[PDB]
Amino acid sequence: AWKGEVLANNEAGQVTSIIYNPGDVITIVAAGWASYGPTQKWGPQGDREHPDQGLICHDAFCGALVMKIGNSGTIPVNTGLFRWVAPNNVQGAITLIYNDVPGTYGNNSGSFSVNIGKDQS
Amino acid sequence: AWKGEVLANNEAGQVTSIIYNPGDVITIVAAGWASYGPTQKWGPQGDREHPDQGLICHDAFCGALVMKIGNSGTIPVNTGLFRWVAPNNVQGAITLIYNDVPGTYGNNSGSFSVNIGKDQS
Amino acid sequence: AWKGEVLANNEAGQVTSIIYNPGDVITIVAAGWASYGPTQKWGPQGDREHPDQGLICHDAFCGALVMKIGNSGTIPVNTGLFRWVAPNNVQGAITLIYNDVPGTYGNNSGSFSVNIGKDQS
Amino acid sequence: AWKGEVLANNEAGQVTSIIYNPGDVITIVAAGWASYGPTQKWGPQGDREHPDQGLICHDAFCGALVMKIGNSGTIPVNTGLFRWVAPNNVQGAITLIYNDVPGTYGNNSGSFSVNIGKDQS
Numbered sequence: 001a002w003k004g005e006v007l008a009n010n011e012a013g014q015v016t017s018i019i020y021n022p023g024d025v026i027t028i029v030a031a032g033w034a035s036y037g038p039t040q041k042w043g044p045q046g047d048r049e050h051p052d053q054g055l056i057c058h059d060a061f062c063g064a065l066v067m068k069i070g071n072s073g074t075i076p077v078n079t080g081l082f083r084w085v086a087p088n089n090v091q092g093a094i095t096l097i098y099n100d101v102p103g104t105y106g107n108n109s110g111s112f113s114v115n116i117g118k119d120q121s
Numbered sequence: 122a123w124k125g126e127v128l129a130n131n132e133a134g135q136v137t138s139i140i141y142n143p144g145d146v147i148t149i150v151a152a153g154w155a156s157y158g159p160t161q162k163w164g165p166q167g168d169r170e171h172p173d174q175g176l177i178c179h180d181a182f183c184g185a186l187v188m189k190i191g192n193s194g195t196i197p198v199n200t201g202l203f204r205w206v207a208p209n210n211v212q213g214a215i216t217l218i219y220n221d222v223p224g225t226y227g228n229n230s231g232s233f234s235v236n237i238g239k240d241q242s
Numbered sequence: 243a244w245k246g247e248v249l250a251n252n253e254a255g256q257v258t259s260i261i262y263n264p265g266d267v268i269t270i271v272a273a274g275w276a277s278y279g280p281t282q283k284w285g286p287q288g289d290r291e292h293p294d295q296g297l298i299c300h301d302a303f304c305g306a307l308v309m310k311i312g313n314s315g316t317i318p319v320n321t322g323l324f325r326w327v328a329p330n331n332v333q334g335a336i337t338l339i340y341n342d343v344p345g346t347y348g349n350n351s352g353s354f355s356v357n358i359g360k361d362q363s
Numbered sequence: 364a365w366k367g368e369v370l371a372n373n374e375a376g377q378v379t380s381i382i383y384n385p386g387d388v389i390t391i392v393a394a395g396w397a398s399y400g401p402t403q404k405w406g407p408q409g410d411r412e413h414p415d416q417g418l419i420c421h422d423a424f425c426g427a428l429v430m431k432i433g434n435s436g437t438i439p440v441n442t443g444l445f446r447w448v449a450p451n452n453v454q455g456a457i458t459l460i461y462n463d464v465p466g467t468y469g470n471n472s473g474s475f476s477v478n479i480g481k482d483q484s
């Protein structure tokens with residue numbers, strides 16, 4: 001299992017110790033407060049009122065927690081995933097990333113605290 | 122395991138099928154959008170800017186998800202709990218509740234979708 | 243989870259730290275060598291050639307590992323149980339017992355090493 | 364998870380659907396009755412009285428359940444493994460095998476019923 005912080009300004013993302021393998025079931029829980037620029041902060045579902053202006057994940061709001069598994073496209077995490085199985089052919093190291101527009105991470109602040117574990121399978 | 126909706130306006134709370142017993146390890150993941158009155162909505166950590174004016178749980182923000190286990194006091198849930206063990210002497214049915222001031226739930230809206238499972242122990 | 247030794251000569255049985263509660267899923271693995279009297283020893287399935295002459299569990303062989311949950315009747319364990327749920331209305335402390343005839347445990351020898359854990363549910 | 368039968372006469376072994384990956388925790392429970400030649404049968408720990416005359420696994424008795432993980436050497440399973448982690452650098456498909464001497468499987472009989480699951484990690 002892995003526990004760590006994902007900084008909102010970390011454009012490259014936070015690599016974890018989890019390698020997602022075919023058949024794995026995982027659970028993620030994410031908590032905390034972060035911002036994509038404003039003084040206000042939002043939780044791991046991000047800001048439901050902010051327009052998508054080129055987010056790395058178009059299936060989640062700006063300021064949401066997302067992930068990549070190996071060389072996958074981004075997958076929403078939001079507050080977490082409960083006993084979750086990846087799509088077919090998706091495997092590799094899990095990297096967690098704050099959802100923002102490439103090149104605009106510099107004014108970001110805060111972080112999410114995230115737990116990932118593998119479940120029975 | 123249990124999955125269901127917790128309505129923001131449900132003052133009595135949403136009873137689940139989970140009976141927390143001594144030694145149990147549980148995981149909760151909560152998602153969604155709710156409000157304690159305003160047109161804006163917040164996630165399961167609630168509104169970090171709103172003053173506590175008599176919330177059922179003073180250890181979480183207004184609009185956060187909280188719970189009671191049996192006849193316990195309220196315990197924050199927020200976005201969820203990862204492989205969590207209850208304090209000593211805490212046991213019984215888990216009821217999930219939106220954090221608001223008693224008697225002020227009528228203007229609430231939205232809901233959270235919540236999964237609870239028991240983990241290995 | 244619990245790990246410990248179950249002595250073949252322990253007529254009252256070995257109490258564990260596991261309280262089986264409604265809905266629990268458990269796994270047991272049992273190992274080792276024991277005898278109900280002869281110099282030969284048998285594993286946790288017991289001796290398939292020995293007649294039942296009043297065993298505490300008539301659904302397992304003499305020399306098998308069995309259990310009681312609370313005040314239940316005996317339930318075969320044998321080599322173990324994989325992600326197992328008890329019958330309706332069965333609950334309480336798990337006691338592990340060597341299967342022999344009441345009053346004939348004195349000439350027994352050896353023991354089984356047993357792990358019990360609760361699984362996801 | 365996988366459940367299936369491992370025939371005592373299956374020299375090549377029974378391939379399972381489990382791929383053991385680095386970091387995995389697994390549980391195995393094995394049950395049943397098999398023989399390496401005699402009319403008598405033994406459980407998954409085999410025959411503690413039979414000399415080793417070239418067994419595929421010298422760390423378990425003749426007639427015991429053993430396994431290979433990928434291209435590993437044989438590893439004892441016996442009655443099972445509880446929340447078990449493999450040695451460093453061991454990974455791949457799990458094949459279950461009855462422990463006997465190469466070229467002497469033809470007179471074997473019976474089988475073991477085996478469950479394998481991955482546990483939390």
Ligand SMILES: [Ca+2]
Nearest residue numbers: 036037104105
């Ligand atoms: Ca930004």
Ligand SMILES: [Ca+2]
Nearest residue numbers: 157158225226
């Ligand atoms: Ca309100």
Ligand SMILES: [Ca+2]
Nearest residue numbers: 278279346347
């Ligand atoms: Ca005896």
Ligand SMILES: [Ca+2]
Nearest residue numbers: 399400467468
């Ligand atoms: Ca043979």
